[PDB]
Design a protein around this ligand. Structure first.
Ligand code: ATP
Ligand code: ATP
Ligand code: ATP
Ligand code: ADP
Lengths: 297, 461, 345, 318, 316
């Protein structure tokens, strides 16, 4: 059993506004462990009662058929039953448009509480047809405390700075730090969790590699760039992770605003190219060439 | 300039400061052919290797099924019928014009195959034909193991992913085109029968206008307009004329432009022009992708401007030696046959309990495998210790060839010289042209390797 | 049973010649319960498949090496071949083309429904090793994550790819990232020397280093070239003529031809060479990578940045488009324009 | 209860606003018996479906409406054309004379083959049945199909005419709205009554009152003040401090880089940049939006927006 | 009730088709000679494809058209079970015809037929060639598989030029006594986009709405982003004047035109604009890239402003 559901328990005001309906469609978004599904289920139990239950959800044809068979059905007798559709963020644009159509022709007697990771919604359900409610993530200190408690009751040997690093590499949510802790204690046999094991589990590139990349760029010789990028690709480090860490380093150190601007334009277009399936090695070589041009000024 | 050094007196503004803090202020605002069908074996045309080499196999050396390849119109449909007529055999035919459900595909051929004729005993033999093949296929594969009457499936590529494993038990022939030395005589006889007159030169021209197609030739006693587009674009408003003149199929126009724009001689320093032309070709490719991914008919109004873009850039004073585009299609079918051959080899190797490598990883790393297969060519004479220590040598090498199912077979060139070729012929899968060529294996060494392969097969079994 | 590249593939995690720390971690992972879904990645020749087979060997029994061919059909019908064992199924759903979604769904459905036939003596799941997950389509990957989360209790997935860039983030979330780096030059020298020793041979360190550098840290290349240079000359020499594939040589000669003259005639000749490379079924991105690597050897330091940026730009456009020759050819043309202007001035 | 979009959906023809030209023309067609096939297109929520429904309801009484007006949606399922549409258009009436009516809502969602089949059906039975095609993008309709019908473009709803309908809604419903709240509601609507009424739902329900801060927080749209702050930081503060300020604001208010970028694009034309600076900014921002649309990291795209402005900082100052 | 002018002035003879002269003459030759072969009819919509095929069949068959001709549209079932059950059974049917006449099967809008249906069509066409002929029709010829084009005399139709549309408009205006001005004719021709059906529909719609035919009425009835506004915005982009071009674009946006409509009219106007031809091609490629973004879904005012900026910087 994963530690995610084992420990799944601020936003009761949305439950209050939902009960005060004597009702629109709902759009709950936020980091996954922020209890959006639990919130809507609690609102369900409070608004109908324990004896009345709802519909929770292959493509879109089966979704439309199920919603039709469910909404076009007489209720016990409150007027509007709902349908959830969690993980809506993964729906394609055509599936989202078909779902928007399904929300119509059924809006007379049913409601939808879409659960998503934010901006993935197309303009039709996101704007109009939904009441948005953002679920803020737990703050860093509370997250570290919760990870400490999990490590205590699971006899996991992790240090406090290890917990801080675990929250850092999974910034903005639980259920990723928790999974990383579980995978780390499985990989190490629980005996000891260090920085390197968390770094490898999270897929983070070591800071020594990033420092070497900047050193090679500052060296001004393209041969060193080729060597460092070839080594970074050979080590198997994802190019998107290198782009993220490189951007985090660049945007915060003491480079010139023009140098930061050029490097960040390059990082953004490299991120777009990598999203389109471009070669990691060529994208990283071009990015490091731009960085070398900026540093070797 | 819009940039101000001091804030506007009565206008809304925002300020922009430099990296040094200098600061500045910006305002913010607000009919004939079937009449002359071959009546007897003597009405066939000469210089033909098809009808002269299938009657050898069709008598009653142990091939089961038949197949087709080569160009169309070569009488592949009528050769079987006239051979049946001459040898005293009957004919059957089938199509996709009727319902070829997988189940009915069985019974539509079983009747043709395993029953005799309700007639005189002379007419009992039958000849069978299957047409327009490119559930039922799996049934064909199941039946092809054992059969009594060979069948013809009309295709044109023996290197197919499915029919290659059927042609291995089939006596597929050579398919040379029919030379017109007697086409003109046949057409003269046809015209005399039909009361028409034409000189030999005129008749020959009418024959060669249609690539000497006998069907079209006999229908003549009664091409491609893309060269016009290529001529209008490649030699001298004009551009509106090319936009209007591109009324036709567009993919082949673009193929012709791509194949021919590097053969013109406007300038040797036109690398900028060819860069712009390749930019336009990439734009056309992206348009083709985007009009399909996001189905949009309005987005395919731009591709007609590719010929216009190849004008302006490359329009010159004549010298338009324009050839038909073949590079893209030839590359397509060659890569398809390479993919079929790698599939054949990988089916030989990958699931054989071992050989843990991706087919792509294997393909990029198989030339070294051939180099291990090379082996010292010391021409072993002794029945033991084949010029070296056998275990670290030819024994392990024949083991690894049996792993990949690589074998050496016998072939005879038309020159008559003996030759051995690797069984799935992975060399041309692996080797490239115009780079330093390595020496190959001797004939007798390949014979020894084949013999060792056979004894290894006997030992493993 | 004879190839050096296969004769000395380690059987168990305990006999891996490199990444021993990760092998120990993997044995710890298999030793405990609730074996998760693995996403093993790393450059080709790093050992991903070797590590996966070893993971199975301590996970299931030795009979995991008793590999037998299987074939199945899908409903769209497309026939696909697989490789299975008494405990795991290995399938590359990419080769089914755009119908990879239905084939992956059908394979996992069938294996999960078939594991229930009293097959729980060793483990309570069947491993479905997917190879070349990065070659799947987005819809296939969404079907994969759905099937993964739906039959987690009865079947386990191991995903093997060379780069996790094309793997959708949702799949990366559900799986455990097992990064298998390419072996270092020293590790490749050590394994080559051990192979030679176990073969009753002797390998000079200079030749081992030369093979390691020429292999580009691909271990199967290192072993293949070692065996090829062995059969070419039984006593190794520190300056031996180590062979290499003809597609690499052809790519290098293509780049040399691009450098040697910058004219549309040379452009058409290089286009013919690009056809030769493409039709031999080597990936267009590999062509671009090798072309750039050799072109940089023939460029001044002031030119290498622009050449590399053009290579990345045109490989990106190649990924967007559908005809690789257009963008390969445009890259070659742009490079000759730049090189001609630079050498001219 | 029932949402106000459905509750306040117009019924009589006089409820519709700003489409007096279109309404007068369609009603004149009805009166003179020259009603052609109709293609109503425009932005969502501007009253095309309500317009055609009002015209159909004045054409046919309630008991004759259900047998003389076939309403179908193309997004529901080519079988539509060959089944219900072909059967309805090819047959005569039940208990009336005159033409029947087909209202195909969301006609832009048909495939091109379906639109060709619909063109054939419309051509064959033009005398007995009139078709009304409702779509958002006229460009999605094949030129063959849109040459069979007269096109009416329902434009966006101007504030000077949108305000009275929302005033009726806020008078009938017990909503307390401010002047700035009404202005913000109109602005976020941008000519969409369905959007305006849904925003009014969400705001008046979650916060109880409708005001600029309330509506902007409910919809999640960035304030004018927040966009001005972002522009000020980008044009004045250094790259690191501007990045920190914008990241903190964005994560505090849950702002989307899509909306931030959309509003900064407007400010780019508001404030008086030099022509070259404006060209550079427009090109860079269009690039950023395109890169956003594919599923990239918003951190890096935000840094690229900051970069696009930091490049122009010194160029503007000099 | 009166027939629409698209049907009121539908050609009934091949002599009154103002389309492509070569193909029309070829069809008249087929109608006169009699032994018409299988023909494929490809071209833009509204050029006369179906009209030409029906006129040819009518001229060939006379009174025997009702029982000798099988006309199938996009609204009919034309699946694999039709080319094999309906088409085959009609081909096998016995109709007595004059010596040079054949049963004509009109698979109209055949580009909508699947690959399997046309494969079924292939030697159903080939076998019964002695007794029946097939007259296909499509907008895109590449949608018809290779064998059908191989065994058909592919006739090509092209967009009616401005002069042909103008002559037919004059004929219809004279026969209908419709007031007009030359500017209204130019507006109708511009909105036609080379379709006679579209030109007739627009003329009839303007007559129905306002009676008089002038540019103002035409663009009031055929509402699209005005070609003059789009033209002057393109001119501003040529002069690298981003501010004025964006003024025009933002005015179009406030009027409510979708970015798809705006970019379509931008391409249409820039296609026949007064530029250096190299700059015109550069503009066309940039507009095509922006339209690809718009169709992909990235359809905002910022995208169109970015297109304007890229056009402006194409001229530096
Ligand atoms: N060797 C030959 N002698 C006499 N006539 C021939 C010969 N080969 C072909 N013909 C004639 O050529 C004409 C066209 O041949 P046909 O249509 O049968 O081509 P095919 O090669 O069988 O076709 P495909 O390859 O497309 O299936 C027929 O009239 C046939 O009799
Ligand atoms: N002129 C108007 N007067 C009053 N309400 C209007 C008007 N236009 C639109 N609406 C409102 O729009 C909502 C439904 O929009 P409707 O379907 O009528 O328009 P539309 O533009 O055809 O929509 P869509 O094309 O997105 O389906 C209702 O809440 C209705 O009150
Ligand atoms: N050359 C022409 N001369 C006169 N009118 C024409 C011409 N071409 C088209 N038209 C007009 O267009 C109408 C239909 O044209 P067409 O023959 O293309 O039929 P269609 O069914 O609309 O075709 P498709 O759906 O295949 O594009 C005719 O009735 C006529 O009003
Ligand atoms: N410890 C090791 N000793 C020898 N060879 C190894 C070792 N680890 C990995 N390899 C090599 O790595 C290669 C496989 O790696 P990889 O490319 O990831 O998978 P695949 O088996 O699909 O090629 C094998 O050829 C194997 O010889």
């Amino acid at each position: 059993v994963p530690w995610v559901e084992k420990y799944r328990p601020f936003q009761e005001e949305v439950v209050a506004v939902l009960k005060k309906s004597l009702l629109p469609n709902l759009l709950f978004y936020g980091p996954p462990g922020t209890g959006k599904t639990s919130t809507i289920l609690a609102a369900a139990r409070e608004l109908f009662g324990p004896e009345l239950f709802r519909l929770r959800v292959r493509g879109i044809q089966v979704v439309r058929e199920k919603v039709k068979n469910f909404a076009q059905l007489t209720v016990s007798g409150p007027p509007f039953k709902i349908v959830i559709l969690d993980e809506a963020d993964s729906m394609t644009s055509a599936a989202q448009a078909a779902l928007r159509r399904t929300m119509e022709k059924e809006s007379k007697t049913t409601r939808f509480c879409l659960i998503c990771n934010y901006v993935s919604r197309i303009i039709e359900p996101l704007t109009s047809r939904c009441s948005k409610f953002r679920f803020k993530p737990l703050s860093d200190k509370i997250q570290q405390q919760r990870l400490l408690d999990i490590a205590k009751k699971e006899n996991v040997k992790i240090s406090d700075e290890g917990i801080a690093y675990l929250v850092k590499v999974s910034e903005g949510d639980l259920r990723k730090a928790i999974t990383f802790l579980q995978s780390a204690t499985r990989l190490t046999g629980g005996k000891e969790i260090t920085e390197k094991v968390i770094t490898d589990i999270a897929g983070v590139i070591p800071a020594e590699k990033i420092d070497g990349v900047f050193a090679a760029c500052q060296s001004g010789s393209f041969d060193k760039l080729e060597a460092v990028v070839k080594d970074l690709i050979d080590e198997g480090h994802a190019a998107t992770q290198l782009v993220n860490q490189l951007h985090d380093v660049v945007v915060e150190n003491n480079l010139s605003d023009k140098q930061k601007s050029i490097i960040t334009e390059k990082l953004a277009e490299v991120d777009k190219c990598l999203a389109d399936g471009a070669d990691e090695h060529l994208q990283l070589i071009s990015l490091c060439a731009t960085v070398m041009q900026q540093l070797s000024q | 300039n819009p940039v101000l050094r001091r804030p506007p007196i009565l206008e809304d503004y925002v300020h922009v400061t430099s990296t040094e803090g200098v600061r500045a202020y910006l305002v913010l605002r607000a009919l004939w052919v079937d009449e002359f069908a071959p009546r007897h074996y003597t009405e066939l045309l000469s210089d033909d290797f098809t009808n002269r080499c299938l009657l050898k196999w069709l008598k009653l050396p142990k091939q089961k099924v038949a197949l087709l390849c080569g160009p169309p119109g070569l009488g592949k449909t009528t050769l079987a019928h006239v051979i049946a007529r001459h040898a005293g055999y009957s004919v059957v035919e089938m199509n996709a014009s009727d319902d070829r459900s997988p189940e009915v595909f069985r019974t539509r051929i079983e009747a043709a195959t395993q029953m005799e004729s309700v007639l005189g005993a002379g007419g009992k033999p039958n000849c069978l034909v299957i047409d327009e093949i490119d559930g039922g296929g799996r049934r064909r594969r199941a039946e092809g193991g054992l059969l009594m009457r060979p069948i013809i499936c009309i295709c044109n590529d023996q290197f197919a992913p499915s029919l290659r494993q059927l042609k291995q038990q089939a006596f597929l022939l050579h398919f040379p085109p029919t030379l017109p030395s007697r086409l003109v005589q046949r057409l003269q006889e046809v015209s005399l029968r039909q009361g028409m007159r034409a000189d030999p030169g005129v008749l020959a021209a009418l024959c060669e206008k249609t690539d000497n197609d006998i069907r079209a030739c006999i229908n003549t006693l009664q091409r491609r307009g893309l060269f016009s587009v290529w001529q209008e674009v490649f030699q001298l408003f004009y551009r509106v004329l090319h936009a209007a003149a591109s009324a036709g199929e567009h993919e082949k126009v673009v193929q012709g432009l791509f194949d021919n724009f590097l053969r013109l001689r406007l300038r040797d320093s036109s690398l900028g022009a060819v860069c712009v032309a390749l930019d336009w070709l990439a734009f056309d490719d992206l348009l083709a992708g985007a009009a399909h991914h996001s189905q949009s008919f309005q987005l395919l109004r731009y591709p007609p401007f590719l010929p216009v873009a190849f004008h302006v850039l490359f329009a010159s004073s004549h010298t338009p030696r324009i050839t038909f585009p073949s590079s893209q299609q030839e590359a397509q079918n060659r890569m398809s046959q390479m993919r079929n051959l790698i599939q054949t080899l990988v089916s030989g190797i990958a699931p054989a309990t071992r050989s843990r490598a991706t087919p792509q990883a294997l393909l990029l790393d198989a030339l070294c495998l051939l180099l291990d297969i090379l082996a010292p060519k010391l021409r072993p004479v002794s029945t033991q210790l084949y010029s070296t220590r056998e275990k670290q040598q030819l024994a392990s090498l024949v083991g690894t060839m049996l792993a990949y199912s690589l074998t050496y077979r016998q072939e005879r060139t038309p020159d008559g010289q003996y030759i051995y070729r690797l069984e799935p012929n992975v060399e041309e899968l692996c080797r490239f042209p115009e780079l330093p060529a390595r020496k190959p294996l001797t004939y007798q060494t390949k014979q020894l390797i084949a013999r060792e392969i056979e004894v290894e097969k006997m030992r493993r079994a | 049973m004879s190839l050096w590249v296969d004769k000395y593939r380690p059987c168990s995690l305990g006999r891996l010649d490199y990444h021993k720390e990760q092998a120990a971690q993997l044995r710890n992972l298999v030793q405990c319960g609730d074996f998760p879904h693995l996403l093993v990645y790393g450059p080709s020749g790093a050992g991903k498949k070797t590590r996966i087979m070893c993971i199975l060997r301590e996970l299931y029994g030795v009979g995991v090496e008793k590999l037998r061919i299987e074939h199945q059909t899908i409903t769209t019908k497309i026939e696909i071949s697989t490789i299975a064992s008494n405990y795991h199924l290995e399938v590359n759903p990419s080769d089914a083309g755009n119908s990879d979604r239905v084939v992956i769904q059908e394979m996992l459905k069938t294996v999960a429904q078939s594991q229930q036939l009293e097959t729980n003596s060793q483990r309570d799941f069947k491993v479905v090793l997917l190879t070349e997950v990065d070659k799947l389509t987005k819809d296939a990957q969404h079907a994969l994550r759905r099937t993964m989360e739906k039959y987690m209790s009865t079947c386990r997935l191991i995903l093997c790819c060379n780069s996790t860039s094309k793997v959708i983030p949702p799949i990366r979330s559900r799986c455990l990232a097992v990064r298998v780096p390419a072996p270092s030059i020293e590790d490749i020298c050590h394994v080559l020397s051990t192979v030679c020793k176990k073969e009753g041979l002797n390998l000079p360190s200079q030749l081992a280093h030369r093979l390691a550098e020429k292999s580009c840290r691909n271990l199967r290349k290192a072993l293949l070239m070692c065996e090829a240079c062995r059969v070419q000359q039984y006593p190794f020499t520190a300056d031996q003529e180590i062979p290499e594939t003809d597609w690499e040589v052809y790519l290098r000669e293509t780049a040399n031809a691009i450098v040697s003259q910058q004219t549309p005639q040379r452009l058409l000749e290089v286009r013919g060479r690009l056809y030769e490379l493409l039709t031999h079924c080597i990936p267009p991105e590999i062509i671009m990578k090798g072309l750039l690597s050799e072109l940089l050897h023939n460029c001044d330091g002031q030119l290498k940045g622009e050449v590399a940026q053009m290579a990345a730009y045109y490989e990106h456009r190649l990924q967007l488009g559908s005809k690789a020759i257009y963008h390969l050819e445009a890259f070659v043309a742009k490079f000759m324009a730049l090189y001609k202007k630079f050498m001219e001035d | 209860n029932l949402p106000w979009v459905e509750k306040y959906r117009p019924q009589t023809l006089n409820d519709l606003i700003s489409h007096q030209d279109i309404l007068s023309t369609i009603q004149k067609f009805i009166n003179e018996d020259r009603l052609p096939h109709l293609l109503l297109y425009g932005p969502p929520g501007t009253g095309k479906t309500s317009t055609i429904l009002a015209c159909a309801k004045q054409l046919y009484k309630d008991k004759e409406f259900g047998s003389m007006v076939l309403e179908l949606n193309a997004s529901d399922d080519i079988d539509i054309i060959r089944g219900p549409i072909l059967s309805f258009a090819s047959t005569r009436t039940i208990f009336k004379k005159g033409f029947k009516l087909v209202i195909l809502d969301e006609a832009d969602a048909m495939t091109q083959d379906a639109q060709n089949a619909l063109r054939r059906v419309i051509e064959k039975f033009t005398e007995n049945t009139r078709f009304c095609l409702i779509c958002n993008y006229l460009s999605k309709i094949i030129p063959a199909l849109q040459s069979r019908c007269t096109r009416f473009r329902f434009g966006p709803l101007t504030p000077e005419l949108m305000v009275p309908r929302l005033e009726h809604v806020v008078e009938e419903e017990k909503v307390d709205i401010s002047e700035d709240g009404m202005k913000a509601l109109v602005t976020l609507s941008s000519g969409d009554m369905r959007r305006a009424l849904n925003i009014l739902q969400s705001t008046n329900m979650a916060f109880g009152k409708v005001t600029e801060e309330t509506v902007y927080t409910c919809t999640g749209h960035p304030l004018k003040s927040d966009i001005a702050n972002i522009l000020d930081w980008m044009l004045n503060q250094d790259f690191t401090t501007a990045y920190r300020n914008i990241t903190e604001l964005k994560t505090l208010k849950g702002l989307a880089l899509h909306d931030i970028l959309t509003e900064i694009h407007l400010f780019v034309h508001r404030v008086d940049f030099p022509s070259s600076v404006r060209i550079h900014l427009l090109t860079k921002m269009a690039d950023i939006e395109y890169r956003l649309s594919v599923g990239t990291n918003e951190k890096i795209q935000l840094s690229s927006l900051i970069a696009a402005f930091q490049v122009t900082r010194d160029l503007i100052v000099a | 009730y009166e027939l629409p002018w698209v049907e009121k002035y539908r050609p009934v003879k091949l002599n009154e088709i103002v389309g492509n002269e070569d193909t029309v003459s070829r069809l008249e030759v087929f109608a006169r000679e009699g032994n018409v072969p299988n023909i494929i009819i490809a071209g833009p919509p509204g050029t006369g494809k179906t009209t030409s095929i029906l006129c040819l069949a009518r001229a060939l068959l006379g009174p025997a058209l009702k029982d000798a001709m099988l006309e199938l549209n996009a609204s009919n079932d034309r699946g694999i079970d039709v080319v094999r059950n309906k088409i085959k059974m009609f081909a096998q049917q016995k109709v007595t015809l004059p010596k040079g006449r054949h049963k004509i099967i009109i698979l109209d809008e055949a580009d909508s037929m699947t690959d399997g249906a046309q494969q079924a069509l292939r030697r159903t066409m080939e076998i019964y060639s002695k007794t029946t002929r097939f007259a296909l029709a499509c907008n895109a010829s590449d949608k018809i598989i290779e064998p059908i084009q191989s065994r058909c005399a592919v006739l090509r139709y092209t967009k009616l030029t401005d002069a042909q549309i103008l002559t037919r408009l004059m004929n219809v205006i004279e026969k209908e006594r419709v007031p007009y001005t030359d500017d209204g004719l130019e507006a109708i021709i511009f909105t036609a986009q080379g379709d006679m059906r579209q030109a007739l529909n627009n003329l009839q719609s303007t007559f129905s709405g306002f009676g008089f035919i002038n540019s103002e009425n035409v663009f009031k009835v055929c509402d699209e982003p005005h070609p003059l506004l789009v033209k002057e915005m393109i001119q501003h982009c040529v002069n690298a004047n981003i501010d004025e071009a964006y003024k025009i674009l933002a005015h179009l946006w406030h009027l409510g035109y979708s970015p798809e409509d705006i970019i379509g009219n931008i391409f249409r106007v820039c296609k026949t604009f007064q530029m250096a031809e190299y700059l015109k091609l550069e503009f066309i490629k940039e507009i095509g890239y922006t339209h690809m973004k718009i169709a992909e879904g990235v359809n905002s005012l910022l995208q169109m402003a970015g297109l304007l900026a890229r056009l402006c910087q194409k001229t530096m």
